[PDB]
Amino acid sequence: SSLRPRREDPPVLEEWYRRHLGPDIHDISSSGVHPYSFAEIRDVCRIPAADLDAVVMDDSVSQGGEGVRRAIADRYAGGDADRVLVTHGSSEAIALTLNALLHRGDRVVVQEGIYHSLGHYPRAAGCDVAVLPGRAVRDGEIDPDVLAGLVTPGTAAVIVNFPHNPTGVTLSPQGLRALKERTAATGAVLVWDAATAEIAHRWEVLADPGADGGDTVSYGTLSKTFGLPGLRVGWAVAPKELLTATFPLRDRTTLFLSPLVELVAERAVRHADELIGARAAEARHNLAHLTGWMAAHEELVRWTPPEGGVCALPVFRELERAAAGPQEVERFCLELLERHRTLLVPGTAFGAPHGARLGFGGPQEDFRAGLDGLSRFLRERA
Amino acid sequence: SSLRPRREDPPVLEEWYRRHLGPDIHDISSSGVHPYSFAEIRDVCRIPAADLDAVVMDDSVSQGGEGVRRAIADRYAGGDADRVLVTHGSSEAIALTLNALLHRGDRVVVQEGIYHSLGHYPRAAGCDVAVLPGRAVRDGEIDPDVLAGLVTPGTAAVIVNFPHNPTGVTLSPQGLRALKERTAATGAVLVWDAATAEIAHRWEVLADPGADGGDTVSYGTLSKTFGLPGLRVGWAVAPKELLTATFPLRDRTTLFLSPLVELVAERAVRHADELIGARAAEARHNLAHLTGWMAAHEELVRWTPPEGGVCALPVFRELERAAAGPQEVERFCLELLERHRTLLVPGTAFGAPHGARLGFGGPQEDFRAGLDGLSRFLRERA
Ligand SMILES: Cc1ncc(COP(=O)(O)O)c(C=O)c1O
Ligand SMILES: Cc1ncc(COP(=O)(O)O)c(C=O)c1O
Domain assignment of residue B382, yes or no: no
Could you count the other beta carbons within 10 Å of the beta carbon of residue B136? Answer: 18
Domain assignment of residue B263, yes or no: yes
Give, using CA atoms, the residue closest to atom 6 of ligand 2: B91
**Distances A369 to A27, A342, A360, B304 between C-alpha atoms, Å:** 9, 8, 12, 68
Q: B309: Cβ below 6 Å to ligand 2?
A: no
- The SS3 assignment for B18 reads helix
Number of domains in chain A: 2
Listed resolution, Å:
2.0
Cα-Cα end-to-end distance for chain B: 54
- The SS3 assignment for A107 reads strand
Residues B70, B46, single domain; the answer is no
Residues A142, A42, single domain; the answer is no
Residues A51, A64, single domain; the answer is no
> What is the rounded distance in angstroms from the CA atom of residue A122 to the CA atom of residue A108?
7
* Residues 70-89 (B) with a CB less than 8 A from some CB of A: 88-89
Residue (of B225, B209, B253) closest to B165 by Cα position: B225
Residues belonging to chain B: 382
> What is the rounded distance in angstroms from the CA atom of residue B357 to the CA atom of residue B310?
10
Residues B239, B150, single domain; the answer is yes
Under 8 Å CB pairs connecting chains A and B tally to: 236
> What is the rounded distance in angstroms from the CA atom of residue B357 to the CA atom of residue B328?
15
The CATH number for B344's domain is 3.90.1150.10
Per-residue burial over A325-342, b = 16 or more CB atoms within 10 Å of its CB, e = otherwise: eeebbbebbeebbeebeb
Q: A89: Cβ below 6 Å to ligand 1?
A: yes
Residues B252, B344, single domain; the answer is no
* Residues 104-143 (B) with a CB less than 8 A from some CB of A: 106, 116-117, 120-121
Q: Which of B245, B273, B301 is the last residue of a domain?
A: B273
Could you count the other beta carbons within 10 Å of the beta carbon of residue B215? Answer: 19
Residues A41, A72, single domain; the answer is no
Residues A174, A243, single domain; the answer is yes
Residues B68, B24, single domain; the answer is no
Domain assignment of residue B122, yes or no: yes
- Provide the domain limits for residue A344: 1-57+274-377
Atom of ligand 2 nearest to the CA of B233: 11
Known binding residues of B for pyridoxal 5'-phosphate are 90-91, 115, 165, 221, 223-224, 232
Residues A173, A267, single domain; the answer is yes
Domain assignment of residue B238, yes or no: yes
Q: Which of B273, B290, B307 is the last residue of a domain?
A: B273
> How far is ligand 1, taken at its centre, from the CA of residue A196, in Å?
9
Q: Which of A273, A308, A334 is the last residue of a domain?
A: A273
Residues B288, B359, single domain; the answer is yes
Contact (CB<8Å) A230/B60: yes
Known binding residues of A are 90-91, 115, 165, 221, 223-224, 232
Domain assignment of residue A382, yes or no: no
Task: State which approach was used to obtain the coordinates.
Answer: X-ray
Residues B231, B151, single domain; the answer is yes
Residue A35 sits at the chain B interface (C-beta within 8 Å): yes
Half-sphere exposure of A259 (CA within 13 A, CB side): 19
By the 8 A CB rule, do A285 and A147 touch?
no
Residue B260 sits at the chain A interface (C-beta within 8 Å): yes
Residues A23, A90, single domain; the answer is no
Domain assignment of residue A35, yes or no: yes
The CATH number for A221's domain is 3.40.640.10
> What is the rounded distance in angstroms from the CA atom of residue B323 to the CA atom of residue B319?
6
